[PDB]
Amino acid sequence: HPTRGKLLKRFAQIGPYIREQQCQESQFFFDCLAVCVNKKVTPEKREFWGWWMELERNGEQLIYYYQVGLFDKNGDWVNQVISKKDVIESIHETLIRFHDFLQAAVSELEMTLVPDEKMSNFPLPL
Amino acid sequence: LHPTRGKLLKRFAQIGPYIREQQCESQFFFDCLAVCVNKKVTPEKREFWGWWMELERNGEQLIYYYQVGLFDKNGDWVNQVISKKDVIESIHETLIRFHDFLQAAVSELEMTLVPDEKMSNFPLPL
């Protein structure tokens, strides 16, 4: 096919990125809590700068849409990022590394990765 | 991701005989054989009341999920516990002491430790 189950399993093998509970039919969800916002906050209320990605399946095509931003206390992602070079670089390194592994996994599945049209406004190289 | 899986494994192993390396992919596995079920049984078929814990990684965050139960003759953990105050108290004491070390290790690693949402159904204080 390959099966949704096959995809889920192979994507989970990339590492601690896929969030299975937020995946449904033909849509997969990945994220990365890359940098803590403020460690003075109690652990359970801490927030993180990072990225999240939505992967739509369209037959043998997987269509990717990454956003950079903020993961708040509720587990909501917001498209706002601290304007610090070092933090942005850290987010970008985790994203690039992930995308490289994703490329490899999709190639092994004999499928193809393609950017969402909204990636034209993505503010980092990829 | 930094720190690495390898570094986390070694750091967690330093806490004591809890982590089970052969059961750790983007998840770490810990357990504790707190109370022997019946000492009259030979050491081959011995079973234990205790706990096990799955620690998930997402970036700088580590997410813990403890369960209390029975480590059976087959080497499988089951979420059932003998309904005895003294046994439950002993399990609980091992768990709290372990958790205190885990908290200190995660802090040393400069990461954030938070309960899994399923810990809302954990039947003991933590």
The verdict on whether omega for the bond into residue B17 sits within 30 degrees of 0, i.e. cis, is: no
User: Per the structure, how many domains does chain B have?
Assistant: 1
d(CA B97, CA B90): 11
> Looking at residue B91, what DSSP letter applies?
H
Residue in chain B lying closest to A35 (CA): B60
d(CA A111, CA B60): 31
Cα of B110 to nearest chain A Cα, Å: 9
* Structural domain boundaries enclosing A83: 1-126
Interface test with A, best of B60, B65, B109, B111 (most A CBs within 10 A): B60
Angle at A55 between CA A51 and CA A61, to 5 degrees: 145
Locate tokens 């052969």: which residue?
Answer: B22
Q: How far is CA B39 from CA A40, A69, A92, B35, B44, in A?
A: 48, 55, 55, 10, 11
Locate tokens 């330093």: which residue?
Answer: B14
Identify any residues that bridge with A53 across adjacent strands, giving them in sequence order.
A30, A66
The beta strand positions in A21-78, using DSSP E, are 27-36, 48-58, 61-71, 77-78
d(CA B7, CA B40): 40
Q: Which run of H or of E encompasses B99?
A: helix B85-108
Other Cβ atoms within 10 Å of A41 Cβ, number = 13
Locate tokens 């430790």: which residue?
Answer: B113
Identify any residues that bridge with A25 across adjacent strands, giving them in sequence order.
none
Identify any residues that bridge with A24 across adjacent strands, giving them in sequence order.
A27
> Looking at residue A24, what DSSP letter applies?
B
Q: What is the resolution of this structure in A?
A: 1.9
Q: What is the DSSP string of A73-121?
A: TTS-EES-----HHHHHHHHHHHHHHHHHHHHHHHHTT-EEEE-GGGGG
CATH number at residue B59: 3.30.310.230
> Looking at residue B21, what DSSP letter applies?
G
Interface test with B, best of A17, A70, A73 (most B CBs within 10 A): A17
Count Cβ atoms within 10 A of the Cβ of residue B5 and give its class: 0-12 exposed, 13-18 middle, 19 or more buried.
middle
- Residue among A15, A31, A36 minimizing CB distance to B60: A36
Solved using: X-ray
Are B28 and B12 contacting, i.e. CB atoms less than 8 angstroms apart?
yes
d(CA B68, CA B90): 11
Q: How far is CA B39 from the centre of its chain?
A: 22
Q: How far is CA B85 from CA B38, B82, B89, in A?
A: 17, 9, 6
The beta strand positions in B2-122, using DSSP E, are 27-36, 48-58, 61-71, 77-78, 112-115
* A48–B26 C-beta distance less than 8 A: no
